[PDB]
Ligand binder design. Sequence first.
Ligand SMILES: Cc1cc2nc3c(=O)[nH]c(=O)nc-3n(C[C@H](O)[C@H](O)[C@H](O)COP(=O)(O)O)c2cc1C
Ligand SMILES: Cc1cc2nc3c(=O)[nH]c(=O)nc-3n(C[C@H](O)[C@H](O)[C@H](O)COP(=O)(O)O)c2cc1C
Lengths: 202, 207
Amino acid sequence: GTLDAPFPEYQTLPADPMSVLHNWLERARRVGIREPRALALATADSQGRPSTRIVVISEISDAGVVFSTHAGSQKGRELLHNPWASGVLYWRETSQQIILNGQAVRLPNAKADDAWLKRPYATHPMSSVSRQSEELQDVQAMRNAARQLAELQGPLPRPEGYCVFELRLESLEFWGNGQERLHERLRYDRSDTGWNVRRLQP
Amino acid sequence: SESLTGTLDAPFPEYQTLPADPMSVLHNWLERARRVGIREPRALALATADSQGRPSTRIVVISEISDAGVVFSTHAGSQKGRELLHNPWASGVLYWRETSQQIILNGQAVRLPNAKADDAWLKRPYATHPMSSVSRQSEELQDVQAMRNAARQLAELQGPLPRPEGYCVFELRLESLEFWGNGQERLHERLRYDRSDTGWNVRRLQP
Ligand SMILES: Cc1cc2nc3c(=O)[nH]c(=O)nc-3n(C[C@H](O)[C@H](O)[C@H](O)COP(=O)(O)O)c2cc1C
Ligand SMILES: Cc1cc2nc3c(=O)[nH]c(=O)nc-3n(C[C@H](O)[C@H](O)[C@H](O)COP(=O)(O)O)c2cc1C
């Protein structure tokens, strides 16, 4: 409640939520919100049990948001059989949330190559040696094998399984704290002609 | 940009020692967070799922840590409430930027008796009662001013209101948890617990 938190969209109801999304992220970066792109990303298994973890949104796309992960991780396995996902951004400084609902699709390997090459190279060793989310049987062995690759110069090859997902959005909500506890919820839903928009009760 | 910003020391001896009882690790971490001044440590990004297994998320606050798990309150008619009533399975993550810690909490949410919900409602500062009484959380809001005006009328009272129908307390009774620390040299420290027939199985996970 500590930085300014303007929400004129709640009055004016903009037609295109992708444009609001881009505006909120720009405002977050320029006012210096701490890790605004840390998304709590929910997926579910074949019984419909949810799982969560943080991932970083690396781009906004025409259809949604983009992140990278490993295909054999829990989220990658869930996504493979059930593409429906939801993520939330929560910015403590302005008391704002963004809720993002949709289906995530794995992008082609060339896109993954590029994502990999644009990471700081210090991240290649461990992300190459680790099989994300599998049982870790020997900590020291992993540390030693990664140190072997850390010593090398330049980028490493993209490991099989390193992959990029686009979460193509079917609904979003923008949430602000409002006045007198009337929290402001702007809710958008894709239609076959564009986007529908409504306010929700707090 | 993909970088974490945490700089506070965050001792994670439990990654080496593998305590048998994961709720002790949850208590340690939460108490550490309290002592070092983490901002809103208990803002929980909670996921539930609809009848087709499609997830939804929002932040709720963990109001208590119980023997079985963690407690929060909400409205039974909300999206999360309707989802939990049909599919009790849920997952929440806490993430603390200052220490680079994450806590993932998975299990089944059970609605606790009304006496519990009465208690929880009463413990709320009564200033929160007016808006929570007039709002049917997550249904469309047709007229913002009518809502504001109606709460303001109730706020005249300057005291506790009766608990609304729908106001409720869920306990998330945990079946699995992960404690995640940044570790050294990007070997992120992942301590994973899963309920057994008695006690818990524990393992480490690859970063
Ligand atoms: C701030 C933060 C950002 C993270 N960003 C990513 C990311 O973008 N991609 C990723 O695979 N894991 C990321 N992780 C690690 C994930 O939370 C998780 O440990 C890993 O992806 C395995 O999740 P899973 O076992 O649920 O599939 C991040 C962790 C933290 C705490
Ligand atoms: C910091 C913060 C804490 C919140 N705590 C709660 C809470 O504990 N209980 C609750 O019902 N909603 C809480 N909310 C509001 C929810 O995020 C959400 O707007 C509301 O519960 C409706 O969720 P739903 O439509 O997905 O069911 C909180 C919001 C913020 C940003």
